[PDB]
Ligand binder design. Structure first.
Ligand code: 0OJ
Ligand code: CA
Ligand code: CA
Ligand code: CA
Length: 376
DNA sequence: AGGACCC
DNA sequence: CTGGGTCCT
């Protein structure tokens, strides 16, 4: 029937993890730097012009007093990421990750259990925790309203637990599907939560200013819709189903058009241990086989540290970039799957390397990544 | 092995 | 010159 989903979204995640490590950064404007980029900054610096993924020189040209911290190494953020997911998994076991700082949790069964605990007395004392989207009025006789309020109380417990137990703040959105939870969780930022009652749903989706803002509609699909005279959510709502299939495929079409009406029936899928783990690095230039081999050696070494834990990988891939992506994989021989070990691994990779780049020709590499997948 | 998508 | 991830085709 009607679900109750929460979407949890950590405030300035990398910045926030750095500030926890020393508050000498907190209260001071702060950017987290990767290569020539500040990828994220604290709010104490966001109001001073600093934007996410902003060029590091333009970031100084709007704030020369910002503290820069190098967050090229994801290790600490990743460990924090799973601590968050695991805490949420305590509430209900089916938690879906999206990147390092977002989780969906299906609160439906939990919402039911709590209501069954209540008497017909306390069913009228129930209150909302956090903002109601659009200041819509609650109607306690509306059983959908009552379930969504209970969901907002659970969302508040989640947020409180994350803070008491891990020191992290985040936003939460409670709604009836995954699309809507995610759209509404950002209505009040940072460190706040908002709940979407059913009658405000159209208000929510029409609140958007371009189709590119609908999660599921990425870089290419946007540029495609934009080339059919489709700019607004309503343009996509009202556009012809038949034509739309012809440019995107009956799959993309019928899904994104449904999204345009705030409709999303995709289940919250339990993420669990990952399906892959890699190590990446980019650079301005790399046109040798010795340079490449050396970079590749570092990536494998860090990867190998992570390769312990839960279980073992039975495939390896190598990714390069030109001047887009090009990969080459192959499986990892039996005896190799026992944890030197670098030596034959480096050989596999370099053979994979040579397979895809002419090592006696000019070649200009701007990225290198080593991936372990197919985990058993 | 590449496509799209996500943060 | 971001450092990671997911599923589908
Ligand atoms: N292409 C990218 N788009 C969005 N985020 C990206 C992209 N590439 C790298 N990232 C990040 C930027 C941030 O450091 C990190 C997450 O950024 P978020 O958009 O989730 O938001 P945030 O936690 O930094 O702050 P906030 O928007 O306040 O919640 C992720 C690696
Ligand atoms: Ca976000
Ligand atoms: Ca975030
Ligand atoms: Ca989008």
């Amino acid at each position: 029937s009607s679900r109750v989903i929460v979407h949890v979204d950590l405030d300035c995640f990398y910045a926030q993890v750095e500030m926890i490590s020393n508050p000498e950064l907190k209260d001071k404007p702060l950017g987290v730097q990767q290569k020539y980029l500040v990828v994220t900054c604290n709010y104490e610096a966001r109001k001073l012009g600093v934007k996410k993924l902003m060029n590091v020189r333009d970031a100084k040209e709007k704030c020369p007093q910002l503290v820069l911290v190098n967050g090229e190494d994801l290790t600490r953020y990743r460990e924090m990421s799973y601590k968050v997911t695991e805490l949420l998994e305590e509430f209900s076991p089916v938690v879906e990750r999206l990147g390092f700082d977002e989780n969906f949790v299906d609160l439906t069964e939990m919402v039911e259990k709590r209501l069954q605990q209540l008497q017909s007395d306390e069913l009228s004392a129930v209150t909302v925790s956090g903002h109601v989207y659009n200041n819509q009025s609650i109607n306690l006789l509306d059983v959908l309203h009552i379930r969504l309020l209970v969901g907002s109380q659970i969302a508040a417990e989640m947020r409180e637990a994350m803070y008491n137990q891990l020191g992290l703040t985040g936003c939460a959105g409670v709604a009836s599907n995954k699309l809507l939870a995610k759209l509404v969780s950002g209505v009040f930022k940072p460190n706040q939560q908002t709940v979407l009652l059913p009658e405000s749903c159209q208000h929510l989706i029409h609140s958007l200013n371009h189709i590119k803002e609908i999660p599921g509609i990425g870089y290419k699909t946007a540029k495609c819709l934009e080339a059919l005279g489709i700019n607004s959510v309503r343009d996509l709502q009202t556009f012809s189903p038949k034509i739309l299939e012809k440019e995107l495929g009956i799959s993309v079409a019928q899904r994104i058009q449904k999204l345009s009406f705030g409709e999303d029936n995709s289940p919250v899928i339990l993420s669990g241990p990952p399906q892959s783990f890699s190590e990446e690095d980019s650079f301005k230039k790399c046109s040798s086989e010795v340079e490449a081999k050396n970079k590749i050696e570092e990536l494998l070494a860090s990867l190998l540290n992570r390769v312990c834990q839960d279980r073992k990988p039975h495939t390896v891939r190598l990714i390069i970039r030109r001047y887009g992506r090009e990969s080459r994989q192959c499986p990892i021989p039996s005896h190799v799957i026992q944890k030197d070990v670098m030596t034959p691994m480096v050989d596999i990779l370099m053979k994979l390397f040579r397979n895809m780049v002419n090592v006696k020709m000019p070649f200009h590499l701007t990225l290198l990544s080593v991936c372990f997948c197919n985990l058993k």
